[PDB]
Amino acid sequence: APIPGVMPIGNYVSLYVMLPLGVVNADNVFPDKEKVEDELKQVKAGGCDGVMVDVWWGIIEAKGPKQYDWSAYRELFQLVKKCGLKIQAIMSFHQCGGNVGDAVFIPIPQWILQIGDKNPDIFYTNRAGNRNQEYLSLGVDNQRLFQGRTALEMYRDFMESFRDNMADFLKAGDIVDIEVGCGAAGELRYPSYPETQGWVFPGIGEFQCYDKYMVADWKEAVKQAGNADWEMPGKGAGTYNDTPDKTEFFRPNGTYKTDMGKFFLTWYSNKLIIHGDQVLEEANKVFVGLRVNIAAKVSGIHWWYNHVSHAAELTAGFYNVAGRDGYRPIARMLARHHATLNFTCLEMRDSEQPAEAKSAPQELVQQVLSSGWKEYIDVAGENALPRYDATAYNQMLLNVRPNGVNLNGPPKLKMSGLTYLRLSDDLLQTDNFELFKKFVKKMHADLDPSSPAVLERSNSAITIDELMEATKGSRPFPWYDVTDMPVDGSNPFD
Ligand SMILES: OC[C@H]1O[C@H](O[C@H]2[C@H](O)[C@@H](O)[C@@H](O[C@H]3[C@H](O)[C@@H](O)[C@@H](O[C@H]4[C@H](O)[C@@H](O)[C@@H](O)O[C@@H]4CO)O[C@@H]3CO)O[C@@H]2CO)[C@H](O)[C@@H](O)[C@@H]1O
């Protein structure tokens, strides 16, 4: 039996904090060096293991193609090192903010947006013809439109430049994770719930497959399945803020359940997966044989999960319904590249959401973490919304270790890390920040604060039908109903 008081170190979960947005501003200038420096001293003294920061494409490659300026990020990194903190870098090929109620606006490079003025089908496009500038459509991954480059090649070249200009932080072990942005907000999904077009929680969202590049691919696919005349969904899909039952496409027994609907949803979600696969392949080509994790971010679309149609997951690109697991195919694709699944909605409870939203974040988390662990990959996480209270910290604590601590060794089920949203003035406010220091100590399983594996070369390409073998629905791992280590110091199993 174990010795009383001895906690095996395998129980430890690393805790990272997200830096403020704009910490390197749109001009490629790192301001408030002295203030930022003191926030980092506090974070380090709170016990955090590191921080996460966006590496914005539209800052670094702003001036033109292959004109990369890393100087400001090099400074920021040197500082984070000197404060004793690890670094998670997001390859952020997307836009930050740009609204009225927004800290900062960092678009993708200006010269890419020029191309878009004359050719707006480089952007994900809804049924009505609206273009979202946040991210380049997967439609354009392999289209040589960008001053003689394709979109995948721009992502490779930027990553190569990052590796080569950060080779010392990388060999020192200062950078531990590269999150590869695969979409809006850096997430592998379609922009189906865009605030810029009127979306409001808990709308069903809308499909984003109507750019001419993606429509060409569709016309071809649908012909080869023996039905030339099958259109992408129309008015039957409804619009962003509909309810499933008010549509033909998502109502019980709606179009989503017909042969046409399945075919379309299979294609739509397969394109997302293929995009993820091609982007992480470049990442793996670049970072092979370095001691660094690569990661992709998956959004938690928890609204309408208790509806049969799972409508908001579907518009987002996750073809997850009864008897079809939509997350396990993605985890399998990730496993081919030895990458980590970062799930970005860990803190929520079902009882905190309105009943008409048919929302099930707890069950959603359990499905995705389970499916990731079953494909032999690591799963890290983040909170979706800023939260300062005990209930939220205890729910994150449950999810990082869903069967609690193991006094005989590494736990059965453990998350690889948690990145907290966000470093801010509200977080450093004395009371808030005292609770946060208890949460970190609990994340560390009452050990004191303290490396990744060498990244293997991507395994063999999995063909599309071997990936569909992964949609076989299965039972998820059993979860505890409360944490082992709540923030109040107590133990619910005396
Ligand atoms: O949109 C608000 C409503 O939707 C919420 O849904 C969330 C998902 O549930 C989350 O899984 C979330 O992802 C977050 C995530 O915490 C983080 O990646 C965040 O901050 C980003 C920034 O936006 C981005 O530009 C990038 O640079 O990195 C930042 C971190 O440095 O981005 C997401 C938030 O934009 O995904 C959606 C939103 O994408 C929520 O569940 C609903 O309850 C809420 O009403």
Side-chain angles (χ1 to χ4, degrees):
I3 302 161
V6 173
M7 178 70 70
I9 65 169
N11 288 285
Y12 189 108
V13 184
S14 308
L15 186 290
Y16 300 101
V17 184
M18 289 180 191
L19 293 188
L21 297 170
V23 66
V24 175
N25 62 29
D27 310 310
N28 214 354
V29 160
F30 173 30
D32 308 8
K33 288 206 260 287
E34 293 79 32
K35 181 193 167 163
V36 162
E37 182 170 21
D38 278 44
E39 292 170 314
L40 297 177
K41 256 181 275 194
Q42 217 162 331
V43 160
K44 177 53 165 197
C48 307
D49 305 280
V51 301
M52 172 187 287
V53 62
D54 289 280
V55 184
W56 299 105
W57 183 28
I59 296 181
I60 305 288
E61 203 174 357
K63 297 188 309 306
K66 306 206 196 209
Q67 296 176 241
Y68 303 110
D69 186 349
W70 301 105
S71 302
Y73 276 97
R74 280 204 60 90
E75 289 175 50
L76 172 54
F77 287 4
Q78 184 51 220
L79 183 65
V80 174
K81 175 166 94 59
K82 270 311 207 300
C83 291
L85 290 167
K86 301 298 201 168
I87 307 184
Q88 310 179 303
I90 304 155
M91 303 300 101
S92 301
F93 301 114
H94 62 283
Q95 174 180 112
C96 195
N99 311 123
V100 285
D102 259 318
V104 65
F105 170 53
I106 307 149
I108 74 187
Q110 177 51 38
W111 56 275
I112 303 279
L113 297 183
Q114 305 288 162
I115 295 188
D117 292 324
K118 301 159 286 266
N119 184 359
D121 292 277
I122 68 172
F123 302 120
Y124 283 122
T125 297
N126 86 340
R127 172 165 91 242
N130 300 340
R131 316 302 189 159
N132 184 335
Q133 299 180 152
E134 274 181 299
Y135 190 78
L136 300 174
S137 163
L138 59 84
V140 155
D141 282 352
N142 289 294
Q143 294 294 143
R144 192 163 298 285
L145 300 175
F146 309 101
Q147 287 185 225
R149 295 190 296 166
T150 215
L152 275 174
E153 285 164 353
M154 293 195 293
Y155 302 156
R156 180 192 62 202
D157 297 342
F158 177 103
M159 276 180 292
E160 277 172 335
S161 189
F162 184 82
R163 182 201 48 216
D164 285 345
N165 282 259
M166 300 290 175
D168 59 351
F169 294 119
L170 285 169
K171 261 270 139 51
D174 300 309
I175 294 166
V176 292
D177 300 296
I178 311 279
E179 321 276 302
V180 195
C182 281
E187 289 171 310
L188 186 63
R189 50 161 190 113
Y190 292 103
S192 49
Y193 52 98
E195 186 224 72
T196 52
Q197 300 175 42
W199 177 77
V200 174
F201 180 95
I204 58 160
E206 287 192 22
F207 297 114
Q208 304 291 324
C209 51
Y210 303 80
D211 76 71
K212 78 182 193 200
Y213 297 104
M214 276 187 87
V215 167
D217 181 280
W218 165 253
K219 274 181 184 200
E220 193 133 284
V222 90
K223 283 155 194 201
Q224 281 171 139
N227 302 86
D229 58 5
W230 274 353
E231 294 218 74
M232 286 183 186
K235 286 188 212 152
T239 63
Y240 294 106
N241 292 325
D242 276 315
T243 264
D245 290 357
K246 288 199 303 212
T247 66
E248 184 62 30
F249 192 98
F250 303 102
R251 60 175 181 91
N253 204 237
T255 322
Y256 83 103
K257 140 186 217 86
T258 59
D259 297 319
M260 169 175 21
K262 292 173 179 197
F263 183 85
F264 167 76
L265 291 158
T266 297
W267 176 82
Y268 188 73
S269 52
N270 279 354
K271 303 296 284 159
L272 182 63
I273 293 171
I274 293 162
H275 181 241
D277 190 53
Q278 296 179 128
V279 176
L280 288 152
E281 175 59 292
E282 298 317 313
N284 192 275
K285 270 192 253 193
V286 171
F287 293 103
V288 224
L290 292 166
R291 296 177 172 287
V292 76
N293 301 299
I294 56 176
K297 300 177 116 190
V298 177
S299 57
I301 299 102
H302 67 259
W303 54 109
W304 308 114
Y305 185 99
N306 292 337
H307 193 263
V308 294
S309 73
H310 290 63
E313 288 163 278
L314 299 183
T315 56
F318 309 121
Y319 184 18
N320 183 52
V321 292
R324 202 189 185 284
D325 187 327
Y327 301 100
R328 207 176 173 174
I330 292 168
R332 189 163 291 180
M333 176 274 289
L334 298 200
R336 190 209 141 196
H337 311 294
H338 310 284
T340 305
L341 193 172
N342 181 177
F343 192 68
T344 62
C345 186
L346 282 197
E347 86 276 16
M348 298 193 165
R349 293 182 65 72
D350 302 355
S351 61
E352 299 167 359
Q353 318 287 341
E356 326 78 65
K358 297 294 222 75
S359 146
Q362 299 184 56
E363 295 82 358
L364 172 61
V365 164
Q366 157 189 45
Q367 200 202 324
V368 180
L369 274 50
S370 289
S371 294
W373 291 322
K374 292 175 179 168
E375 294 300 322
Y376 296 95
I377 54 157
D378 288 332
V379 185
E382 302 178 346
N383 50 307
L385 295 175
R387 288 289 290 276
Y388 301 107
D389 50 282
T391 296
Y393 295 130
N394 289 338
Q395 187 60 207
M396 292 190 271
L397 289 164
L398 176 54
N399 291 332
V400 304
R401 279 185 308 252
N403 283 1
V405 304
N406 178 358
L407 306 178
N408 306 309
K412 189 185 170 137
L413 306 172
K414 199 196 84 173
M415 295 183 72
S416 46
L418 198 149
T419 305
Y420 178 86
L421 176 153
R422 185 186 292 280
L423 190 52
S424 62
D425 287 337
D426 281 3
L427 172 64
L428 304 166
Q429 286 181 187
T430 324
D431 293 359
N432 279 170
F433 192 72
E434 280 291 337
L435 191 47
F436 183 89
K437 290 190 287 183
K438 304 225 233 292
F439 169 66
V440 170
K441 196 57 140 50
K442 301 298 164 179
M443 285 288 302
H444 296 344
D446 286 353
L447 300 158
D448 294 314
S450 314
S451 258
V454 178
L455 184 64
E456 292 191 39
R457 186 71 199 101
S458 291
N459 286 11
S460 297
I462 309 168
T463 165
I464 291 156
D465 267 300
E466 299 188 59
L467 219 63
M468 306 298 274
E469 291 165 339
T471 66
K472 198 164 188 283
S474 63
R475 216 184 135 178
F477 300 110
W479 243 244
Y480 280 18
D481 53 323
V482 298
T483 35
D484 205 305
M485 312 266 285
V487 285
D488 69 10
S490 73
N491 180 25
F493 308 104
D494 281 332

